[PDB]
Paper text:
The chromosome region maintenance 1 protein (CRM1) or Exportin-1 (XPO1) binds 8–15 residues-long nuclear export signals (NESs) in hundreds of different protein cargoes. NES sequences are very diverse but each usually has 4–5 hydrophobic residues (often Leu/Val/Ile/Phe/Met; labeled Ф0–5) that bind hydrophobic pockets (labeled P0–P4) in a hydrophobic groove formed by HEAT repeats 11 and 12 of CRM1 (9–16). Here, eight new structures of CRM1 bound to diverse NESs show several different and unexpected NES backbone conformations that share only a common one-turn helix element. All NESs also participate in hydrogen bonding with Lys568 of HsCRM1, and mutagenic/structural analysis identifies Lys568 as a selectivity filter that blocks binding of non-NES peptides.
Because most previously studied NESs have substantial helical content, we also study five NESs that match class 2 (Ф1XФ2XXФ3XФ4) and class 1b (Ф1XXФ2XXФ3XФ4) patterns, where the hydrophobic residue positions do not suggest an amphipathic helix. The previous structure of RevNES (class 2) suggested that its three prolines may constrain against a helical conformation. Class 2 NESs in the Mothers against decapentaplegic homolog 4 protein (SMAD4NES: 133YERVVSPGIDLSGLTLQ149) and the fragile X mental retardation protein (FMRPNES: 423YLKEVDQLRLERLQI437) have few to no prolines but still bind CRM1 with mostly loop-like structures. Class 1-R NESs are strand-helix peptides, class 2 NESs are mostly loop-like and class 3 NESs are all-helix peptides. (A–E) FMRPNES (light orange), SMAD4NES (salmon), HDACNES (slate), PaxNES (pale cyan) and FMRP-1bNES (deep teal) bound to the ScCRM1 groove. This conserved turn of helix is flanked on one side by additional turns of helix (classes 1, 1-R) or by loops (class 2), and on the other side by β-strands (classes 1, 1-R, 2) or β-turn (class 4), or the helix ends as the chain terminates or exits the groove (class 3).
Author numbering:
A (entry chain D): 141 to 149
B (entry chain B): 63 to 69, 78 to 200
C (entry chain A): 9 to 216
D (entry chain C): -1 to 376, 414 to 440, 461 to 1053
């Protein structure tokens, strides 16, 4: 899973 | 074809400051502080008169626990037991009805909320001086 | 507009402290046992207009019971209180309920388990089932933390008015008057203020 | 005032004045009302007011005045009936019976004064409990006879019988002696055949709704105790399940009756009984579907509208269905002609389970647990309920409540859903994926709705196979990441990202098998620990420690293709990672690291990891200890105080998770920490001296005491988990006692830390047996000065109070020798302190007080026949007996009854086993050779005579004979004590009641 790219912005 | 379809008194004010706080009143006869309400303390600026008041309501019930002008003659003092509260005399608060005098204390979540309240409180006194 | 509410339960369960919280916003730390009853008017502002409760805060200690079930006559609603830190006060809930509904046969009743703020809870949530067959509303409450402290009155207001969508609303906030302090009372206010400054605020460890 | 006139009994009672006071109380307000209240209470409480009740009940025109009059009579009947002259007893009976008859005969009074008639009925029942049947054998025959002369009298007799049943069978355990309860239960049993005849006839024939309802209300009470044959060998079930379900007037009570019927003790091998049990359920569900609402009806909406009595009816229907089906659903599960009935009943429960009402949902959820647990274990059952279960999955998923991240309700919901997942894993996955799409397509999107679904997905961890869970978890997190990207604004993106981290934290099996992924998770949490949006930091930290607890092993080994154990990577960057966290969140981070470090079982590597983790706080520590030692004034700087407290809090956090392994770090700071404790103590005392007691409230001193409290907490935390107790004794205890005991003793009460007591309790608990001289030192320094703080009332110094008796308890358990060494005057204060604890209503104090007394007696008994034990009994045996009796009988310590009874039984048994080797009496007061048995019985008879002068000598002697005989049988002993507590509340109790056991 590409969880590295999770972002709040 | 036209189808007929199926059938607070704070609105004229502006919110300058808003902070969560707990408000106390001093029972001189019992020589102890008594809680009066926990909720949002608001600095409200009347659009017509530009006069700023404190208005504070209790959570849930929304009942008024503070309603008075931020008089320029008022003075915020520390309380012996707290680095996050202010004590000051109030001559005319109408939370429970007739303009009654009180010694209030208001406490905040942190010392920096208390210091900011002081900042905003003194700005508001200047507004009310003009 | 006006409804008689009887508040019953064992001594020390917090009935008077609960009412006081609603009347003035204060939390009374001391236990001063109620003698017989104290009647207190309590008004709530709702989207259907104001509702007035005449609260009959009765004594839970037997040696202070006064008229006992004589206080229940013509009540239109009730709150039964117990203390989740004291099992005996829950064991007595059926006794209070018995004496209540023998006088008031068809009224809305709220069962309140008070003092849920205390860590060492003794009456566990799953043990509390008495309300089920008796059609009582149940709430965990805390007069100290205000947890659910408004729910008993909101639920009763909906029952008594017959409107399930009734809500508490913000009471109107009139413009406060302008200030003119008396220079003759300037010396008396410094005295009252000095004492207040040097009296420590309570519960300085609370979040507020 | 004028109202006070009724309080003067020398003159005749002015009935009109009474009615004015009553009206003012009930109908008035403020001071008028308050004044009348105190007058009415004084009136009612006059021990002669009962003499004026016949006047009030004859001549008053105010029903409240008559009610009060009956309350006054009730007091007299309940407490002093048997003291009266027999003429008054007959007279009082006569004008109660007459008053009831005349109120029933006047049709206007019967309809308008129900409260007064009900109070008169209850008053009559009190007389029956005294007089019937032994002095009133014809009450029931005459009741049945008078019922036929009038509907109103017949209806009121149903009320009287209802209250009688309640008083005898439902509320007698507390209020009567065992013998009196059995006597009344037997009497009602003897005459119930006639009562039932009247009740069944009224139900079969009667038209009067009000009379039918009264009769069914009484039947509800009868079903608590009557034999099942009255229910199954008559036609009454048919009447209840058809006729009375169709009329709404009778429907509520009838449903409650049928619920109790479902609980009758019933033979389980009779096939006719079984068909009758099927039949009344079938009838009832039929009447509901045709007269109330069909099974398709939207009960959620009906309940919300809250018309009439719909809410109570739906509550009562849930109770009936759940009660019956939990007992009897197997009766419906084999017969194919009963399958529609079984599923319709459960479909109603499905619809009831959608109601928005938390307490009712819990009632239906309890039943669902009962069902799915059975389907999980019982062969060949789950296929019957497949469609019910499929709907239930959706109901539970959609009403999932917030887990710890209400808590009790989450766990109940999780349990049912786990069962439901095992029952059909494929159906559960499909519902959850489907719900997620409607979050993505916006049709059900909301903060509440994505949270609820995430909690549900998290709740079923461990139920799928690892391969199916892997596919499921991947799909869920992929969908959630797309959902987060798709949303705009920090508010929404924060909610979704939290739920993502919640799901991940709930699937440790998946993380354990996918290191690369687990590593990516942690690094994202670390990124989030710099996010300032409210709640994100707390979320990242809670998730971090939660994953570590479950996956710590994968942080402590070197993973394939990695350069080092990941714990080393965490520690190296710890300053950066936590730079933006609040102190509380930093300490959680360090605690999480301590959990990992403790999984390293090579000592040298674990100790190295520990000293690397503590590098930042140790350097701050070394700096301050170098400074504050040079300029003790620096500790008045609030900033240094706060830094110091956070350092110590960091050590507490790591010690909490490492326990015994923390010892090397404790050794690094221990000696300077206790020096800091002394310095801070000096500054607190100096501040109190210069400013007064008010100084204890100032931020400065509260900050200084925080340091002291955290130091004590650190030492307590380590010692409570220490495995090497030789080092505790030889290295830790001596400096600790020297640092804390004198300082506690010689501070003014308002400056003593209760945490000192708590810390000493742990020292004694863990190594008390190894430090007898140290325990003596503890008592010497805290016993008398703490007792003087707490022995002037029950309120002041509440923490010291609790910790004080916990310390004495453990000393009494582990180092009783220390109480032996007390000088006699101090041992007497120890005994006073224990009894002082008895009298507390605070449960924390009371329970320990009673346990200390019990353990103390056993400690003394163990000593055998030696002078200290001999002197103990001579000085204190009767003190403990009478103080225990005092709290048993004073009505203000009901919560400690069981422990009081145990202590009392132990004391009495010492004498009746001749385990006390010396006479308990003086030389002069009793002849030589008198057994302690005779003397104890004599001392107790005299004690109870003076304390309860209204008991007869025969009552006291029968009570003591029984109590003494039963001092090996705790349940019976307790029964006899309860009997005594009933008898002391009245006059004329029967002394043969104490023969109840035999
Ligand atoms: N921790 C805690 N204490 C509470 C709470 N509510 C009440 N108390 C405390 O419980 C004690 C008894 O309070 P009180 O209101 O007098 O109980 P009561 O039911 O009115 N007693 P009585 O029937 O004899 O008049 C008080 O010390 C009160 O401060 C609570 O919610 N939490
Ligand atoms: Cl619900
Ligand atoms: Mg009270």
């Amino acid at each position: 899973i590409d969880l590295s790219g999770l972002t709040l912005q | 074809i036209h189808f007929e379809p199926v059938v607070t008194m704070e609105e004229d004010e502006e919110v300058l400051y808003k902070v969560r706080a707990k408000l106390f009143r001093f029972d001189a006869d019992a020589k102890e502080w008594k809680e009066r309400g926990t909720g949002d303390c608001k600095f409200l600026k009347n659009k017509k008169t530009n006069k700023v008041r404190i208005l504070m309501r209790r959570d849930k019930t929304l009942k008024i626990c503070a309603n008075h002008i931020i008089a320029p003659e008022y003075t915020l003092k520390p309380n012996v037991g707290s680095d996050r509260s202010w004590v000051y005399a109030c001559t005319a608060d109408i939370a429970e009805g007739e303009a009654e005098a009180f010694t209030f204390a208001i406490r905040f979540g942190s010392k920096e909320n208390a210091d900011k309240f002081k900042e905003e409180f003194e700005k508001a006194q200047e507004i009310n001086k003009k | 507009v006006q409804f008689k509410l009887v508040l019953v339960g064992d001594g020390g369960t917090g009935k008077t402290t609960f009412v006081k919280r609603h009347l003035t916003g204060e939390f009374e730390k001391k236990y001063v046992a109620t003698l017989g009853v104290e009647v207190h008017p309590l008004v709530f502002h709702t989207n259907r207009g104001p509702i007035k409760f005449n609260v009959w805060d009765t004594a839970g200690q037997e040696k202070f019971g006064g008229l006992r079930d004589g206080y229940y006559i013509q009540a239109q609603c009730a709150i039964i209180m117990f203390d989740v830190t004291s099992r005996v006060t829950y064991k007595n809930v059926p006794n209070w309920h018995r004496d209540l509904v023998r006088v008031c046969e068809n009224i809305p009743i709220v069962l309140c388990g008070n003092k849920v703020d205390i860590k060492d809870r003794k009456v566990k949530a799953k043990s509390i089932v008495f309300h089920r067959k008796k059609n009582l509303q149940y709430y965990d409450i805390s007069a100290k933390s205000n947890y659910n402290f408004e729910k008993p009155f909101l639920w009763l207001a909906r029952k008594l008015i017959g409107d399930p969508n009734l809500e508490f609303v913000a009471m109107p906030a009139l413009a406060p008057p302008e200030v003119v302090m008396d220079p003759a009372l300037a010396a008396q206010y410094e005295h009252d203020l000095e004492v207040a400054q040097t009296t420590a605020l309570p519960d300085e460890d609370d979040d507020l | 005032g004028s109202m006070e006139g009724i309080l003067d009994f020398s003159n005749d009672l002015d009935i009109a004045l009474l009615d004015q006071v009553v009206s003012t109380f009930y109908q008035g307000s403020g001071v008028q009302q308050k004044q009348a209240q105190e007058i009415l209470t004084k009136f009612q409480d006059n021990p002669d007011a009962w003499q004026k009740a016949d006047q009030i009940l004859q001549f008053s025109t105010n029903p409240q005045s008559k009610f009060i009059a009956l309350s006054i009579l009730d007091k007299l009947i309940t407490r002093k009936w048997k003291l009266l002259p027999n003429d008054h007893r007959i007279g009082i009976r006569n004008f109660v019976v007459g008053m009831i008859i005349s109120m029933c005969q006047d049709d206007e009074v019967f309809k308008t004064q129900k409260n007064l008639i009900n109070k008169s009925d209850l008053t009559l029942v009190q007389i029956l409990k005294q007089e019937w049947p032994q002095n009133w054998p014809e009450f029931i025959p005459e009741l049945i006879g008078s019922s036929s002369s009038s509907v109103n009298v017949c209806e009121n007799n149903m009320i009287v019988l209802k209250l009688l049943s309640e008083e005898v069978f439902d509320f007698s355990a507390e209020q009567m002696t065992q013998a009196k309860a059995l006597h009344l239960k037997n009497s009602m049993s003897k005459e119930f055949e006639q009562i039932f005849k009247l009740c069944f006839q009224v139900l079969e024939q009667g038209s009067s709704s009000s009379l039918i309802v009264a009769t069914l209300e009484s039947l509800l009470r009868y079903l608590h105790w009557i034999p099942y044959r009255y229910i199954y060998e008559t036609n009454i079930l048919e009447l209840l399940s058809t006729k009375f379900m169709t009329s709404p007037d009778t429907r509520a009570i009838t449903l409650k009756c049928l619920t109790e019927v479902s609980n009758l003790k019933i033979p389980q091998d009779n096939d006719l009984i079984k068909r009758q049990t099927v039949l009344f359920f079938q009838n009832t569900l039929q009447q509901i579907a045709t007269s109330v609402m069909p099974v398709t009806a939207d009960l959620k909406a009906t309940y919300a509208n809250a018309n009439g009595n719909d809410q109570s009816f739906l509550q009562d229907l849930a109770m009936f269905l759940t009660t019956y089906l939990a007992r009897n659903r197997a009766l419906l599960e084999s017969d194919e002609s009963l399958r529609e009935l079984l599923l319709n009943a459960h479909q109603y429960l499905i619809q009831l389970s959608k109601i928005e009402e938390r307490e009712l949902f819990k009632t239906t959820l309890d039943y669902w647990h009962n069902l799915v647990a059975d389907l999980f274990y019982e062969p060949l059952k789950k296929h019957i309920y497949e469609e019910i279960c499929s709907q239930l999955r959706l109901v539970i998923i959609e009403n999932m409540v917030r887990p710890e991240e209400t808590i009790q309700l989450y766990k109940s919901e999780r349990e049912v859903l786990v069962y439901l997942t095992h029952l059909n894993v494929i159906d559960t996955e499909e519902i959850m994926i489907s719900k997620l799409a409607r979050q993505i397509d916006g049709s059900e999107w909301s903060w509440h709705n994505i949270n609820t679904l995430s909690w549900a997905i998290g709740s079923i961890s461990g139920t799928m196979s690892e391969d199916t869970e892997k596919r499921f978890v991947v799909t869920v997190i992929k969908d959630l990441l797309g959902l987060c990207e798709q949303k705009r604004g920090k508010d929404n993106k924060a909610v979704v990202a939290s739920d993502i981290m919640y799901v991940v934290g709930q699937y440790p099996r998946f993380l354990k098998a996918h290191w690369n992924f687990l590593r990516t998770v942690i690094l994202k949490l670390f990124e989030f620990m710099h996010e300032t949006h409210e709640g994100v930091q707390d979320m990242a930290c809670d998730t971090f420690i939660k994953i570590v607890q479950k996956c710590k092993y994968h942080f402590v080994i070197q993973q394939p293709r990695e350069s080092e154990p990941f714990i080393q990577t965490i520690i190296r960057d710890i300053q950066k990672t936590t730079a933006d966290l609040q102190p509380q969140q930093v300490h959680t981070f360090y605690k999480a690291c301590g959990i990992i470090i403790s999984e390293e079982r090579s000592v040298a590597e674990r100790n190295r990891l520990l000293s690397d983790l503590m590098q930042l706080p140790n350097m701050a520590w070394d700096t301050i200890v170098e400074q504050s030692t040079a300029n003790p004034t620096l500790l008045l700087d609030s900033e240094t105080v706060k830094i110091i407290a956070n350092i110590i809090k960091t050590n507490v956090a790591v010690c909490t998770s490492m326990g015994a392994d923390f010892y090397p770090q404790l050794g690094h700071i221990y000696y300077n920490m206790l020096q800091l404790y002394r310095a801070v103590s000096s500054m607190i005392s100096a501040q109190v001296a210069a400013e007064g007691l008010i100084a204890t409230k100032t931020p400065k001193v509260r900050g200084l005491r925080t340091i002291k409290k955290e130091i004590l907490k650190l030492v307590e935390t380590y010692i409570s988990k220490a495995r090497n107790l030789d080092d505790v004794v030889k290295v830790l205890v001596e400096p600790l006692l020297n640092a804390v005991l004198e300082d506690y003793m010689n501070n003014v009460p308002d400056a003593r830390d209760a945490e000192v007591l708590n810390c000493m309790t742990t020292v004694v608990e863990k190594v008390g047996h190894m430090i007898p001289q140290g325990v003596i030192l503890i008592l010497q320094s805290v016993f008398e000065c703490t007792l003087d703080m707490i022995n002037k009332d029950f309120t002041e110094y509440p923490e010291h109070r609790v910790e004080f008796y916990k310390l004495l308890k453990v000393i009494n358990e582990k180092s009783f020798a220390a109480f032996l060494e007390l000088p006699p005057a101090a041992f007497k204060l120890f005994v006073d302190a224990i009894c002082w604890a008895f009298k507390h209503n605070n449960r924390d104090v009371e329970v320990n007080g009673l346990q200390i007394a019990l353990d103390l007696v056993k400690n003394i008994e163990r000593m055998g026949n030696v002078p200290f034990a001999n002197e103990f009994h001579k000085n204190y045996f009767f003190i403990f007996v009478s103080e225990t009796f005092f709290v048993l009988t004073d009505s203000d310590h009901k919560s400690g009854f069981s422990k009081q009874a145990l202590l009392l039984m132990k004391l009495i048994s010492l004498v009746y086993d001749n385990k006390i080797s010396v006479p308990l009496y003086q030389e002069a007061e009793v002849p030589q050779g008198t057994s302690n048995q005779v003397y104890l019985s004599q001392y107790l008879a005299n004690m109870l005579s003076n304390a309860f002068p209204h008991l007869t000598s025969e009552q006291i002697a029968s009570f003591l004979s029984a109590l003494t005989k039963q001092c090996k049988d705790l349940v019976v002993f307790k029964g006899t004590l309860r009997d005594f507590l009933v008898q002391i509340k009245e006059v004329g109790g029967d002394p043969t009641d104490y023969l109840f056991a035999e």
